[PDB]
């Protein structure tokens, strides 16, 4: 439900206030049962996540255990690998920036705890190129850990071998995709591959590979070291566990709090963070999972709590759980319009739907903000939207269509008036 | 996306990794599996950018040589990513985040202030070559929606006057306290932490026999 206890808050060093470095980490006791866990077995680790029923902490939601289970199949003579994507291009995902800037070890032991679960030879962490600062913090942390012998061959005084590496991103949101990151590592252009060859079977350097949101890798060790069931209790049904929530825009105290999942949307701005700037009635709309997920208008805001099942009932996605809030002084139409501008400046262009479709919606959306376009065009953008939604090679085209669909779904009268406003002044 | 050879930006310019740089080069390679030096392109191309911001056609060709890859390969990587600059950026490259999260926090409000202070249009270098302003997209520090990235400095919660203090510090002197401004630090509920105030539970706590 809500009011996650500090005693249950995984990322204790959030907000810093501790030594993100190892000695702070030791007081955190992050490396407490690592040898034991690995000793227990890879099968024991996946039992822990299956019991946890953790969902993907990245924009896509899938059982974390089943995804890791897939490349637990016997090696075919190719080294298995771990890829941690610290890229978070999605607006409002400062969620991950926290775990690299702070509590970097949380992720380092997440990597080896996760590594033996998939039997990965090594893990590469792709941080956003922008986070040069963040990249500096982690390898200082990674360097500490090996010096200790926590990672490396015979890591944590155990038979198992692991090596952790950090890879420089280069300002691309699409590099965040499950497969495209792999291609970026491989050194080719960051263009996603098709799903038929699933990442596990075909991978980074053509070997089995797996990709996890940094939050997903980070919570593993604590979910196993601590009781996974313990975590499970926090979640709701399929939904489970605490996921960091970032609230940004039109709220009195924008902040990232790792409060519990399944939180009433009205409650998290009202109780933690900062109540919606201007009052809870000054809420034109809420973007729950970030730019990719459709915004939900106030009417439904207070009604649904934050969890992926509840949101999909609501037609929106928990995604990165980045809450972007809009007051009534905003231009709903120009707000979403810049997100389509966010996607035309960013989609790879590999696939026909997304390439021309996202540019086509950008042109129509800019006209919509001006009000130059006629009212009949508004549903035509509906139809352009679903052509892009099911036909794209990756999910970004999936993502571009949803905000457009949300604007037409709940704010169709406002766009018509902008249509009307321009027609009147001629 | 076409490199029309120009006396300044052309193959004529000689590029070569400093003895120190070449060292760095190798370090990167080994990170990748053997015989996969190809992957070194992005990281290496980045060090060519570290060497020189311009990174001219000559520099890319050099990268191809070092990693043994086909030049077109490197050319494709450089063009795809915004991080690499194929034109001479200014000494201080100021990038203002203008995605919706920041906009709603008047990120644009920052823009107008910076254009006037630099006294220049958005997208080009100052005559002084001192600063270069560009309207970049989300930088991943939405919590502090007002935000500008100055050569990694990554400042935040910036207000016209805040940027004012910052731009003056860059123009005279250096290292202008890069980071947030209001003192909200990184993602602190401004009013109060409201959480994590309780002391760390300590190692062992909650193990619950896993």
């Amino acid at each position: 439900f809500g009011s996650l206890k500090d005693e249950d808050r995984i990322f204790t060093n959030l907000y810093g206030r501790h030594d993100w470095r190892l000695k702070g980490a030791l007081r955190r006791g992050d490396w407490y049962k690592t040898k034991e866990i690995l000793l227990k077995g890879p099968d024991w680790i996946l039992g822990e996540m299956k019991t946890s029923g953790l969902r993907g902490r990245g924009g896509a939601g899938f059982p974390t255990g089943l995804k890791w289970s897939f490349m637990n199949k016997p090696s075919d003579g190719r080294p298995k690998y771990l890829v941690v994507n610290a890229d978070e291009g999605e607006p409002g995902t400062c969620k991950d920036r926290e775990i690299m800037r702070h509590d970097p070890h949380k992720l380092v032991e997440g990597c080896l705890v996760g590594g033996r679960a998939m039997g990965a030879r090594a893990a590469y962490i792709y941080i956003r190129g922008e986070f040069y600062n963040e990249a500096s913090n982690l390898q200082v942390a990674i360097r500490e850990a090996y010096e200790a012998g926590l990672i490396g061959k015979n890591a944590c005084g155990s038979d198992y071998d692991f090596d952790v590496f950090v890879v420089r991103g280069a300002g691309a949101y699409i590099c965040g995709e499950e497969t495209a990151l792999i291609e970026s590592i491989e050194g080719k252009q960051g263009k996603p591959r098709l799903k038929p060859p699933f990442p596990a079977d075909v991978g980074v350097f053509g070997c089995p590979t797996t990709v996890a949101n940094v939050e997903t890798v980070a919570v593993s060790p604590t979910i196993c070291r601590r009781g996974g069931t313990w975590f499970a209790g926090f979640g709701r049904e399929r939904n489970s566990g605490t996921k960091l929530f970032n609230i940004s825009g039109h709220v009195n105290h924008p902040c990232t709090v790792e409060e519990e999942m399944s939180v009433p949307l009205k409650e998290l701005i009202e109780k933690h963070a900062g109540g919606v700037t201007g009052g809870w009635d000054n809420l034109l709309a809420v973007i729950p999972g970030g730019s990719s997920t459709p915004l939900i208008p106030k009417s439904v805001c207070e009604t649904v709590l934050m969890d992926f099942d509840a949101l999909v009932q609501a037609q929106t996605g928990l995604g990165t759980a980045a809450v972007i809030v809009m007051d009534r002084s905003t231009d709903i139409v120009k707000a979403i319009a810049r997100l389509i501008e966010f996607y035309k400046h960013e989609s790879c262009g590999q696939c026909t739907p997304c390439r021309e479709g996202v540019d086509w919606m950008n042109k129509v959306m800019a006209r919509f903000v001006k009000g130059d376009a006629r009212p009949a065009e508004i549903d035509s953008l509906w139809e352009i939207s679903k052509q892009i939604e099911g036909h794209t090679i990756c999910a970004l085209g999936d993502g571009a269509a949803w905000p457009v669909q949300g604007l037409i779904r709940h704010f169709r009268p406002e766009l018509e008036d902008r249509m009307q406003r321009f027609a009147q002044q001629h | 996306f076409v490199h029309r050879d120009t006396p300044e930006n052309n193959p004529d310019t000689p590029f070569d990794f400093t003895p120190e740089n070449y060292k760095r080069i190798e370090a990167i390679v080994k990170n990748y599996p053997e015989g996969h030096q190809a992957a070194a392109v992005l990281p290496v191309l980045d060090l060519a950018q570290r060497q020189n911001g311009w990174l001219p056609i000559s520099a890319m060709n050099k990268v191809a040589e070092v990693l043994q890859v086909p030049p077109m390969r490197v050319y494709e990587v450089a063009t795809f990513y915004t991080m690499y600059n194929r034109k001479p950026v200014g000494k201080y490259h100021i990038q203002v985040c203008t995605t919706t999260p920041c906009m709603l926090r008047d990120s644009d409000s920052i823009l107008e202030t910076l254009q006037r202070k630099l006294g220049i249009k958005v997208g080009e270098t100052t005559p002084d070559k001192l600063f270069t302003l560009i309207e970049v997209e989300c930088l991943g520090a939405c919590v502090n929606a007002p935000m500008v990235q100055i050569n990694d400095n990554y400042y935040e919660d910036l207000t016209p006057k805040d940027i004012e203090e910052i731009i003056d510090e860059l123009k005279a002197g250096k290292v202008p306290k890069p980071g947030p401004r209001s003192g909200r630090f990184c993602c602190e509920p401004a009013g109060g932490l409201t959480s994590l105030t309780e002391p760390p539970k300590g190692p062992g706590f909650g193990v619950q026999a896993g």
């Binding site: 080294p79 490396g152 | 760095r24």
Partner: peptide, 23 residues
């Protein structure tokens, strides 16, 4: 921090990294 510090950390963690497989 400086432009070359991230890669120098890599320069340093080279030894830390054990050997890499070859195809």
């Amino acid at each position: 921090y400086n432009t070359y510090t991230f890669l120098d950390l890599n320069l340093d963690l080279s030894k830390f990294r054990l050997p890499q497989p070859s195809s």
